[PDB]
Design a protein around this ligand. Structure first.
Ligand SMILES: *[C@@H]1O[C@H](CO)[C@@H](O)[C@H](O)[C@H]1NC(C)=O
Lengths: 49, 50
């Protein structure tokens, strides 16, 4: 069956490229929303707000 | 947390991400020649720096 899929065509490289683009875009969305400022800030122990 | 990483020397220094592995861990090809006497250019895994 692998040989039949090999001589049938090469669509799964395209499929994996699309899915890898989707995954990289998911990580880029997460960096776009949450990362923002690179510097991490500690909780302000002085709590008189 | 993602799984089992074999072939990368885990370092518990915190560098910025080079190759996103997953589960907050990144890999990078770093120069160990200047680090440990006469060592070899090698792949290191670590926890990515936020
Ligand atoms: C990582 O931490 C362990 C103990 O927590 C320490 O022995 C080791 O030197 C550190 N660095 C490594 C494994 O590169």
């Amino acid at each position: 069956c692998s040989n039949l899929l090999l001589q049938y065509g090469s669509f799964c490289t395209q499929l994996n490229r699309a899915l890898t683009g989707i995954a990289v875009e998911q990580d880029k969305n997460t960096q776009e929303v949450f990362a923002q400022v690179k510097q991490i800030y500690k909780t302000p122990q002085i709590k008189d707000f | 947390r993602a799984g089992c990483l074999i072939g990368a020397e885990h370092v518990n220094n915190s560098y910025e991400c080079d190759i996103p592995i997953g589960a907050g861990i990144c890999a990078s090809y770093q120069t160990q020649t200047n680090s440990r006497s006469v060592a070899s250019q090698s792949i290191i895994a670590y926890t990515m720096s936020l």
